[PDB]
Write a protein that binds this ligand. Structure first.
Ligand SMILES: CCCCCCCCCCCCCCCCCC(=O)OC[C@H](CO[C@@H]1O[C@H](CO[C@H]2O[C@H](CO)[C@H](O)[C@H](O)[C@H]2O)[C@H](O)[C@H](O)[C@H]1O)OC(=O)CCCCCCCCCCCCCCCCC
Ligand SMILES: CCCCCCCCCCCCCCCCCC(=O)OC[C@H](CO[C@@H]1O[C@H](CO[C@H]2O[C@H](CO)[C@H](O)[C@H](O)[C@H]2O)[C@H](O)[C@H](O)[C@H]1O)OC(=O)CCCCCCCCCCCCCCCCC
Ligand SMILES: CCCCCCCCCCCCCCCC(=O)OC[C@H](COP(=O)(O)OC[C@@H](O)CO)OC(=O)CCCCCCCCCCCCCCC
Ligand SMILES: CC1=C(/C=C/C(C)=C/C=C/C(C)=C/C=C/C=C(C)/C=C/C=C(C)/C=C/C2=C(C)CCCC2(C)C)C(C)(C)CCC1
Ligand code: SF4
Ligand code: SF4
Ligand code: SF4
Lengths: 393, 365, 110, 200, 148, 189, 55
């Protein structure tokens, strides 16, 4: 062995394995003791070349790829890639279909917020939110397997006209039971942090992200709300009738890990309130009342029309898109998702520019890891809620 | 009764020279205590696995035997069959004998713990010295294995684990000193006799309540239950370099240290081989108990049972408090140790000396 | 920097094996053919593989030492191994612990 | 020759040695220490088994982050060619009685990235010898337990007299090249860079 | 445990096809599969759900169509019979061959009689089919399972 | 200076009370039964929406080559020939690889004559990958039912429980699909 | 029964209660039943005494 201890700064090379919950990222940490001076991130072990996939591909052949873009929720990319051609060609959408769309989007946002505080609390302390959070997510897994057929992203469920399938018979009742049971589980998770030992004092002043630096660096998502900027993209642009229920954006004063935790903790309750008001909506009730009013009443008298249908119009498999470019923005669980699509009157599009939400937020990680300890590196890496499939893509 | 005296008389009736006959009598209990120690280790591994399963609402290892009790035996039989791998360095004998230097004295310290008046090995004067000075050797083997590890991160983790281990030796000695002052002796036999004189009212847990908590915190820091030093600055502290054999040796050594600490804490504070009702009243109520062994054998079995339920209770409490209290950093652990266990231990020794010099009636005199 | 590129059969190491380890050296390229028990070999086809490796390392001249060119040389070597297998030469062996046809399945010409 | 890719052609035992071989195989069947390696949602599907719903621990498999105390590796996820020498070194640093379970459609073959792709590796069997394949995108955790069951059925096929197969032959060859020396790659040097604070 | 002797080999040499009942929680047929290699038989692992037709894959040659992506044209690969080519360059000692089917639950009872006649037509290879089993290791004749 | 000592003592007794509350909830967690399932002794019930293997029929097929363009990888091949006696084409061979399959069930939806079917098979484990080109007579077999196997124990998932059950392990009644089927509503109401 | 007729499952133990299906083929006393729910066509097999013919 040749270990010559000298008076030079030690370069720590964190490998791209990360065998706790993280993907592939080569971190080169340069320090001179019990601090952190420099940090170099190296990516490129998960890039699959998605932009070359959409060079010769139609809309019906791009759904599993665009669902395998991000492996946390997936349906946000499907929702924007069924919104881009329907706005390029000008195809309307029914109200009940958009209600089902926003219900499934908020139900995936619930699971996406649930898969952040697992490793973030595991890498800082006791390893017993793990099994209960995984049980609470396996409940959502069984609910989605009963509803559509799968537990996550491998699920098409979306076309240009609307949703090809419908909800089952007991899905609304089990969803009401899940809204009954999910609220004390998040009150317990807030009571775990509202009166605590030094866990509150440990991650209290490690980030310290100011407002103007977050605006200049281009932060979007829960970090922009933790900095104190009300830029929720669902309030700027009404996506699918977002101006009908009550809304409340949780805004924190300072930007730290505890504030970014409690913003998502409150946002769980806000999403529960939104899906409760969506169950309070649904103009026509569940599928049983709709089937009874269809089979009991006349053929086209009052119920069967344009607004309350499965799709509304069966689209062609090989259809032509109009020539032009388009850009839409949707607030996702990580940040803002956008698609810059260019068509030139053909089946296969010309340019498919993808706007990733985590690749723009990863630029704060060289600024965040500066002058901190060794044990705060994994907590800082887990607090931003980044995904290697989103920054490599 | 006396099995050793009867064996000596039988070997004298057979015809021998009284020296080689008495020479070979000791290795049979000297191997019996070792094999029941491995039995207790195979008990404790299955117990820790099934209790960690029952805490997190699941079932432990199954489909290996009746309920998976052969799984520690299967692990110990499989890990000695694996290929011993070596890194690209020198000093292969040092890398081999490092874990041997770790494993020798913790296994050697089995001559101290008792199980009764006669069911023990050595009680000469100073068994607490033979525990402390032999348990304070394993940092040398840890630093030797870290130097023979040939790594930048594993050596730093071994240095951090050695600095964590050597700091909790001084309150571990002061809490022993606070009981040895009151017991006016260093052997465990007089310590357990001063507790087994009376029943509950002569226990050292009610006489020294702060020292028991200090000794328990020092034992949980020494046997690496709450300090996670096995995410340790890249992946692990003193791991990711050995094979299945050296990892199995480290695992059994850690479980031997846990079993020995869980026995020694109860022996020094609560007291194995003890009953809430004194044995003299039961012996006077039953009949004549001075030569009849039919009740004495049952009393020895009851003392072994009391020691075993105390050891099982302390093991279950330690492995229940492992996943109960959250993980704290090693710097905060060293800070809380050096700022709590030493000053309250010193003032506890001072108030112990003051209470012994004030009223020497209920203390050791 | 230890430059290497190996998949299952070829090992192009940019060093030199002294006894059991390697040292970084940009002057010697060591080639290891089929380290795992997957194909049975001989002395003539291995000599043809070594001659093709010498021809491929004589073709690549005046270029920088990067991972891309070394991986391209290893890919041409594995393509030569696959064409030698398809030519009517040595193939798989029924003596390993696992039998996975990674290059091709035995088929019929006519 | 009319046959493409040909296959070359390649006893009393004791009862006590047979029982010792049964014990030696039963120990490996009972312990079965795995390695958790995952870069995508297949790692989340593997971590869903570690939770208290499917109880993957009850067969004897315990989660270890060390690629040295694991006799079984579980590769999972879309594999980039930049991660292929990393996977080769992680497989080679394991001890000799090792097993390979490949979970996923993009792992055992090209998967969805087999039509228009230039970075994804089309098959992990080109990198590591796969013993038990597992199709599915993503597969059921019951299918992963079925692959564990088939691996346990395949481990007991080994012998104690035919143990001379877990090695690698030498076949060394030494040749020279005429390549040019390359400048080194960046190691750090991100924040305190001379072109970062001072604008050119 | 249970010290098993040499009894499956005699039952395999007496009849032509056997069906063993194993517990599906782990693996216990590997001991008999290793005892068969210790007696001098060459084992061949094969999966029973994916086989196509038994006649065209075991007696004659078949044509496999690889999955093309539109890049290549429609090609056909001529696959020989598996057990015939395994019996061609087989023998070190010329004792016998066995065929092991892992998941024999996803099969019909029509091809089982054809397989039991095929293993009796050529006396050089055996047929071993696995059933999901009921709590104990027991062997049964495959012709008796077909007839009943 | 004494107020910092009293604040430290208050923080210490609050940490001791938090440790005691953690011990209390840990002792509370030992009372509930385990909610896990055994394999292969307690297999889950597949729902009507959970997909699986692709089943192909050789009778209700016309070889129209429609579902090949719907597939992004074009995995089902159509080996069709042209016959001069008839006026249409016939299918000779049908092969499909399953190692590159996404299992999204998109070619089954765009089928007017329902030539493809969903089969409840997920137990696919093979030591080699070259047998994955499944034949039509291999895809035309009978699926394995989890009910008819007497060695497994049937247990439903969370969303298949009557009137709301949080455990879903005992199931003493025989009721399922919590709600009402749309047949008795037309009878009563 | 004949392949091509509509049957109905009436077993109170299974999850599929009173579901109309299409018979595909008959072998070994087992009936393949094709269900039509939504936009996907599932095929769940049953027995010969489990189903009842519905005109
Ligand atoms: C969660 C954790 C779980 C932990 C695990 C729990 C599960 C396992 C629990 C198992 C129980 C734990 C072990 C028991 C405590 C250890 C007792 C022991 O070590 O104890 C050691 C004992 C020795 O202890 C005592 O030893 C005495 C000798 O003591 C002398 O020697 C001692 C030193 O050994 C002390 O110094 C003592 O002061 C001194 O007096 C006598 O021998 C006593 O009889 C004996 O009880 O070893 C023996 O038992 C003798 C060794 C066997 C010798 C066989 C006897 C010889 C055969 C005689 C046959 C006679 C045949 C002729 C018959 C005549 C026919 C007419
Ligand atoms: C197929 C494989 C087959 C393997 C075959 C192996 C068979 C042989 C091993 C079997 C061991 C199990 C059988 C139990 C024997 C227990 C005998 C016993 O305790 O014998 C007692 C004697 C008593 O010793 C004598 O006891 C005397 C009386 O003292 C006792 O009483 C005094 C009263 O004040 C004091 O308390 C004193 O401390 C206490 O020891 C003196 O101490 C003498 O010095 C000493 O000789 O111990 C002795 O000699 C020492 C005996 C050592 C036994 C230690 C084993 C652990 C005990 C089993 C665990 C308890 C299980 C009971 C289960 C019942 C459940 C309901
Ligand atoms: C019947 C026998 C029961 C004995 C059980 C006792 C064993 C428990 C020992 C704790 C091990 C873990 C130590 C971690 C402790 C931990 O991690 O936090 C320790 C915590 C550190 O807090 P901070 O980091 O804020 O403090 C340092 C900073 O303030 C720096 O300025 O506070 C302490 O220093 C106070 C310690 C009180 C500890 C009390 C322990 C005893 C609690 C239970 C009392 C039980 C009474 C039972 C009556 C029946
Ligand atoms: C005579 C005899 C016998 C008997 C026995 C017995 C009777 C026993 C029992 C006993 C027991 C059975 C014991 C045990 C115990 C244990 C436990 C039970 C522990 C646990 C607990 C804990 C550790 C906890 C903690 C806590 C605290 C401290 C605080 C508060 C809260 C709580 C409570 C949680 C026999 C048969 C053997 C034989 C021989 C003789
Ligand atoms: S097979 Fe599917 S689930 Fe697995 S890594 Fe590939 S895309 Fe993800
Ligand atoms: S399965 Fe359907 S789409 Fe495919 S060739 Fe047959 S009829 Fe046409
Ligand atoms: S499920 Fe999808 S990937 Fe599989 S064959 Fe059908 S269209 Fe192709």
């Amino acid at each position: 062995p040749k270990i010559e201890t000298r008076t030079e700064p030690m370069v720590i090379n964190m490998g791209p394995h990360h065998p706790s919950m993280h993907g592939v990222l080569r971190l080169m940490v340069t320090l001179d003791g019990e601090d952190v001076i420099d940090c170099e991130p190296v990516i490129g072990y998960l890039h699959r070349g998605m932009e070359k996939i959409a060079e010769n591909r139609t809309n019906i052949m791009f759904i599993p790829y665009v669902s395998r873009w991000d492996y946390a929720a997936g349906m946000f990319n499907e929702a924007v890639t069924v919104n881009a051609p329907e706005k390029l060609a000008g195809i309307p959408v029914p109200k009940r279909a958009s209600y089902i769309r926003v219900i499934m989007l908020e139900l995936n946002r619930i699971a996406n917020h649930l898969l952040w505080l697992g490793p973030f609390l595991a890498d800082v302390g006791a390893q017993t939110p793990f099994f209960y959070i995984f049980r609470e997510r396996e409940y959502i897994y069984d609910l989605f397997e009963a509803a559509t057929g799968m537990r996550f992203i491998n699920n098409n469920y979306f076309r240009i006209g609307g949703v090809a399938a419908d909800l089952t018979y007991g899905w609304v009742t089990k969803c009401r039971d899940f809204c009954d049971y999910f609220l004390p589980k998040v009150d317990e998770y807030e009571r775990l942090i509202t009166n605590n030992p030094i866990f509150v004092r440990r991650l209290q002043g490690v980030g310290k992200i100011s407002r103007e630096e977050a605006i200049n660096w281009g932060l979007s998502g829960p970090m922009l709300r933790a900095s104190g900027v009300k830029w929720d993209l669902r309030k700027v642009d009404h996506y699918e009738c977002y101006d009908d229920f009550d809304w409340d954006v949780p805004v924190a004063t300072e930007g730290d890990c505890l504030a970014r935790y409690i913003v998502r903790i409150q946002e769980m309750r806000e999403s529960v309130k939104i899906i409760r008001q969506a169950l309070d909506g649904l103009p026509g009730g569940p599928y049983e009342n709709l089937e009874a009013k269809r089979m009991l009443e006349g053929a086209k008298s009052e119920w069967n029309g344009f607004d309350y249908q499965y799709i509304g119009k069966k689209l062609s498999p090989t259809f032509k898109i109009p020539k032009g470019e388009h850009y839409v923005r949707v607030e996702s669980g990580k940040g803002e998702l956008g698609i810059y699509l260019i068509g030139d009157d053909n089946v296969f599009p010309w340019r498919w520019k993808i706007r990733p939400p985590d690749f723009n937020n990863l630029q704060v990680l060289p600024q965040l890891l500066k002058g901190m300890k060794v044990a705060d590196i994994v907590a800082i890496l887990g607090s931003i809620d980044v995904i290697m499939g989103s920054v490599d893509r | 009764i006396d099995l050793q005296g009867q064996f000596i008389s039988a070997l004298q009736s057979l015809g021998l020279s009284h020296d080689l006959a008495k020479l070979l009598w000791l290795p049979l209990p000297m191997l019996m205590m070792l094999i029941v120690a491995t039995v207790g280790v195979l008990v404790a591994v299955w117990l820790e696995r099934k209790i960690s399963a029952a805490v997190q609402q699941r079932i432990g290892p199954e489909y290996i035997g009746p309920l998976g009790i052969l799984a520690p035996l299967a692990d110990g039989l499989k890990l000695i069959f694996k290929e011993d791998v070596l890194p690209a360095n020198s000093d292969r004998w040092l890398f081999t004998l490092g874990p041997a230097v770790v494993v020798i004295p913790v296994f050697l310290s089995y001559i101290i713990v008792p199980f009764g008046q006669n069911l023990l090995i050595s009680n000469l004067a100073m068994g607490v010295f033979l525990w402390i000075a032999l348990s304070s050797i394993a940092p040398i083997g840890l630093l030797m294995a870290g130097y023979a590890s040939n790594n930048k991160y594993s050596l730093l983790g071994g240095l951090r684990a050695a600095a964590q281990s050597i700091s909790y030796e001084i309150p571990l000695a002061l809490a022993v000193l606070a009981v040895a002052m009151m017991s006016n002796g260093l052997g465990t036999v007089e310590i357990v006799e001063q507790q087994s004189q009376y029943g509950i009212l002569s226990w050292n847990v009610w006489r020294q309540p702060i020292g028991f908590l200090v000794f328990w915190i020092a034992a949980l820091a020494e046997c690496e239950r709450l300090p996670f030093d096995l995410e340790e600055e890249l992946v692990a502290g003193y791991q990711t370099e050995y094979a299945g054999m050296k990892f199995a040796l480290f695992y059994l050594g850690a479980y031997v240290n846990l079993v020995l600490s869980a026995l020694l804490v109860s022996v020094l504070y609560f007291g194995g081989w003890s009953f809430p009702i004194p044995l003299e009243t039961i012996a006077n109520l039953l009949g004549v108990s001075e030569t009849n062994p039919f009740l004495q054998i049952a009393f020895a079995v009851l003392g072994i049972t009391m020691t075993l339920i105390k050891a099982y209770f302390f093991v279950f409490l330690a492995i229940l408090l492992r996943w109960t209290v959250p993980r704290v950093r090693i710097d905060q652990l060293l800070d809380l140790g050096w700022k709590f266990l030493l000053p309250v231990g010193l003032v506890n020794l001072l108030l112990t000396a003051g209470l012994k010099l004030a009223f020497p009636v209920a203390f050791g005199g | 920097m230890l430059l290497k590129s190996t998949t299952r059969h070829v090992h192009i190491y940019a060093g030199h094996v002294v006894d059991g380890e390697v040292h970084p050296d940009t002057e010697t390229l060591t080639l290891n053919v089929d380290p795992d028990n997957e194909l049975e070999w001989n002395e003539a086809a291995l000599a043809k593989v070594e001659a093709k490796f010498r021809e491929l390392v004589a073709n690549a001249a005046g270029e920088d030492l990067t991972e891309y060119n070394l991986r391209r040389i290893g890919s041409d070597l594995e393509h030569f191994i696959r064409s030698l297998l398809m030519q009517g030469e040595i193939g798989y062996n029924l003596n390993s612990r696992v039998r996975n046809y990674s290059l091709g399945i035995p088929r019929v010409n006519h | 020759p009319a046959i493409l890719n040909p296959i070359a052609r390649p006893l009393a035992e004791n009862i006590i040695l047979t029982s010792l071989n049964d014990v030696y195989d039963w120990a490996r069947l009972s312990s079965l220490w795995p390695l958790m390696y995952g870069t995508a949602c297949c790692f989340i599907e593997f971590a869903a088994m570690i939770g208290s719903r499917f109880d993957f621990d009850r067969f004897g498999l315990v989660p270890r982050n060390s690629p040295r105390q694991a006799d079984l590796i579980i590769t999972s996820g879309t594999i980039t060619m930049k991660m292929a020498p990393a996977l080769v070194r992680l497989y080679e640093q394991m001890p000799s009685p090792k097993y390979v379970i490949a979970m996923g459609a993009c792992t055992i073959t090209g998967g969805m990235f087999s039509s228009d792709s230039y970075s994804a590796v089309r098959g992990v069997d080109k990198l590591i010898p796969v013993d038990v394949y597992l199709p599915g995108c993503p597969p059921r955790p019951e299918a992963i337990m079925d692959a564990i069951v088939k691996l346990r059925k395949k481990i007991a096929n080994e012998h104690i007299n035919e143990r001379g197969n877990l090695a690698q032959t030498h076949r060394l060859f030494t040749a020279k090249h005429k390549m040019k020396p390359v400048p080194p790659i960046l190691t750090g040097q991100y924040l305190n860079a001379p072109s970062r604070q001072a604008p050119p | 445990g249970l010290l098993a002797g040499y009894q499956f080999v005699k039952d395999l040499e007496s009849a032509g096809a056997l069906a063993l009942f194993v517990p599906p929680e782990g693996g216990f047929e590997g001991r008999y599969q290793r005892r068969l290699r210790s007696k001098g038989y060459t084992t061949l692992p094969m999966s029973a759900p994916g086989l196509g037709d038994l006649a065209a894959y075991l007696t004659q040659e078949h044509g496999i169509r690889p999955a093309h992506t539109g890049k290549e044209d429609i090609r056909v690969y001529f696959q020989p019979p598996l057990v015939t080519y395994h019996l061609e360059n087989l023998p070190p000692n010329a004792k016998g061959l066995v065929l092991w089917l892992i998941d024999g639950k996803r099969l019909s009872k029509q091809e089982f009689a054809y397989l039991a006649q095929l293993t009796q037509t050529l006396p050089k290879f055996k047929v071993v089919v696995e059933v999901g089993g009921d709590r104990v290791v027991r062997w049964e004749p495959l012709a008796d399972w077909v007839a009943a | 200076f004494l107020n910092q000592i009293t604040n430290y003592a208050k923080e210490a007794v609050q940490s001791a009370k938090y440790i005691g509350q953690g011990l209390s909830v840990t002792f509370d967690h030992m009372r509930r039964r385990p909610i896990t399932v055994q394999y292969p002794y307690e297999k889950l019930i597949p729902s009507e929406r959970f997909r699986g293997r692709i089943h192909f029929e050789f009778d209700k097929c016309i070889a129209c080559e429609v579902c090949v363009r719907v597939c992004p990888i074009n995995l089902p091949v159509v080996d069709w020939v042209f016959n001069k006696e008839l006026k249409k084409k016939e299918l000779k061979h049908y092969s499909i690889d399953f190692g590159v399959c996404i299992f999204c069930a998109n070619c089954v939806e765009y089928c007017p004559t329902n030539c493809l079917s969903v089969t409840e098979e997920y137990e696919l484990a093979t030591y080699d990958r070259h047998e994955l080109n499944y034949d039509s007579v291999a895809m035309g077999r009978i699926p394995y039912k989890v009910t008819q196997d007497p060695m497994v124990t049937p247990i439903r998932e969370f969303a298949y429980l009557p009137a709301g059950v949080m455990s879903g392990h005992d199931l003493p009644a025989g009721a399922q699909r919590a709600g009402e089927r749309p047949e008795a509503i037309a009878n009563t109401a | 029964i004949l392949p091509g007729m509509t049957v109905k499952v009436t077993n109170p133990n299974d999850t599929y209660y009173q579901f109309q299906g299409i018979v595909q083929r008959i072998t070994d006393g087992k009936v393949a039943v094709l269900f039509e729910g939504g936009n996907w066509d599932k095929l769940v097999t049953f027995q010969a005494s489990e189903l009842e013919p519905v005109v």
